[PDB]
């Protein structure tokens, strides 16, 4: 019974570990793509303020 409960709790918490680990990591992937898209889409409309500034400060 000691070996059986050891093996059963092992398989139980490794199922738990596997499922919750992949459910966490895919959600972090989703939120990471959302954050990258959000900062790029905020920067695109924000652009062309920059290029005139850098071309003004490089040129005399």
């Amino acid at each position: 019974e000691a070996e059986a409960k050891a093996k059963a709790l092992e398989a139980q918490y490794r199922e738990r570990e596997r499922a919750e680990t992949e459910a966490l990591l895919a959600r972090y992937r989703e939120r990471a793509e959302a954050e990258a898209k959000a900062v790029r889409e905020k920067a695109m409309a924000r652009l062309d303020e920059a290029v005139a500034l850098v071309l003004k400060e490089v040129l005399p």
Binding site: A2, K5, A6, L9, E10, Y13, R16, E17, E20, T21, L24, L25
Partner: protein, 62 residues
């Protein structure tokens, strides 16, 4: 005879003392086996939950 019955008493007394000593021994044996198995089971929740928590630590950091 008297010592007929007394030697029968001696055999019964030695058997009864033998089985009382054996009762005390068997009770201590089931006590020590149960204590060892429950020390095992108390250590295994540490040895498994600590692994699970450290896994979630490094997964969250990653």
């Amino acid at each position: 005879s008297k010592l007929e019955a007394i030697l029968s008493q001696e055999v019964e007394a030695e058997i009864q003392a033998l089985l009382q000593e054996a009762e005390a021994k068997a009770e201590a044996v089931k006590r020590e086996a149960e204590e060892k198995a429950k020390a095992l089971l108390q250590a295994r929740e540490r040895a498994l939950e600590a692994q699970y928590r450290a896994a979630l630590r490094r997964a969250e950091s990653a």
